[PDB]
Structure formats: structure tokens, C-alpha cells
From Swiss-Prot:
It comes from Coxsackievirus A16 (strain G-10). The chain holds residues 869 to 1007 of 2193 of the full protein. This is Protease 2A. The lineage of its organism: Viruses, Riboviria, Orthornavirae, Pisuviricota, Pisoniviricetes. Zn(2+) 1 binds at C50, C52, C110, H112. Cysteine protease that cleaves viral polyprotein and specific host proteins. It is responsible for the autocatalytic cleavage between the P1 and P2 regions, which is the first cleavage occurring in the polyprotein. Also cleaves the host translation initiation factor EIF4G1, in order to shut down the capped cellular mRNA translation. Inhibits the host nucleus-cytoplasm protein and RNA trafficking by cleaving host members of the nuclear pores. Counteracts stress granule formation probably by antagonizing its assembly or promoting its dissassembly. Homodimer.
Length: 139
């Protein structure tokens, strides 16, 4: 579990979105596994606007943060799950690191702020849904 709170927005993995998220929907994209909903309280996360390929992520299955080198956002094949059939997920960045399904929502941060959230994993790899291109999160 986990979300990003920036201004009047809440960013979560689309497959983990709640009834409230869907009732206050701003935007959603199945191909990215992202959903943004509105909030009544004000958020203070800083979204990074950069091309960093190093950062730190939170891994709930280990109660620890880990430093990682990660790839540039791209289309990556993802196996079928209970939420999606087998497909290419876009705007995904991979890194070598531990992750389990419950780790989704954990934040990846670089020196500039929030980069994205855990969205996929398996076999010693962890994938993050990028949020740095969503310029509207700020205005
Ligand atoms: C962090 O996730 C994992 C880590 C280790 C092993 C397995 C996973 C799970 C995983 O990759 N998915 C894909 C994900 C998606 N974005 O399509 C949806 C899902 F969470 F239900 C299953
Ligand atoms: Zn950065």
C-alpha cells in the first residue's frame, strides 16, 4: 500500500484504488497502473522534474529503504494478474531490488523529490510507475 499527496491530489496504484478514489476520480490510466483522485486536505510532496536514474525506495516487506539505479521509463511486459491480463505497462522503470506484491505504493525518491511508486516486481527486480511527466500535478 501507499500513495503520493501533492496539492489537492492523491496518487495511488490503479489496482489498489478505493471506492472513494473512484468517486473523486481526476484521471486514471490502466496501461500505467495509475489513478489520481482529489482530496479535501492539502498535500506537501514535492514531485521531481528530472531524468535521475538513481534514488531510494521504501520496501514494506522488509521495513527498510534501499538505494537503487533504475532504468528510463518505458513499455515493459507484465504477466497477467487478477487485475490485468498480460500486457505492456508504459512509463515503467526497473531496478534490481527486493519487492513482493504488497510493496506496491512504496515511494521512490531522488534528491529532487518523488519519482514514482512501486507497481511491479519479481525475480530480484522491482518496477516503479513514473510520475515525473505529470506536470499538471503541480498546477
Ligand atoms: C510489486 O509487485 C510484485 C513484486 C514481486 C512479485 C510479484 C509482484 C506483483 C506484480 O508485479 N504484479 C503486477 C501489477 C501490475 N502493475 O500489473 C499488479 C499486481 F500487483 F497485482 C501483480
Ligand atoms: Zn531527480
Amino acid at each position: 500500500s501507499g500513495a503520493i499527496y501533492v496539492g489537492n491530489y492523491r496518487v495511488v496504484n490503479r489496482h489498489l484504488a478505493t471506492h472513494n478514489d473512484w468517486a473523486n476520480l481526476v484521471w486514471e490510466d490502466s496501461s500505467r497502473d495509475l489513478l489520481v483522485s482529489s482530496t479535501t486536505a492539502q498535500g506537501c510532496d514535492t514531485i521531481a522534474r528530472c531524468d535521475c536514474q538513481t534514488g531510494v525506495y521504501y520496501c514494506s516487506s522488509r521495513r527498510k529503504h534501499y538505494p537503487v539505479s533504475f532504468s528510463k521509463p518505458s513499455l515493459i511486459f507484465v504477466e497477467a494478474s487478477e487485475y490485468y491480463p498480460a500486457r505492456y505497462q508504459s512509463h515503467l522503470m526497473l531496478a534490481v531490488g527486493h519487492s513482493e506484491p504488497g510493496d506496491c505504493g512504496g515511494i521512490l525518491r531522488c534528491q529532487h523529490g518523488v519519482v514514482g511508486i512501486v507497481s511491479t516486481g519479481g525475480n530480484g527486480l522491482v518496477g516503479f510507475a513514473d510520475v515525473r511527466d505529470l506536470l499538471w500535478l503541480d498546477e
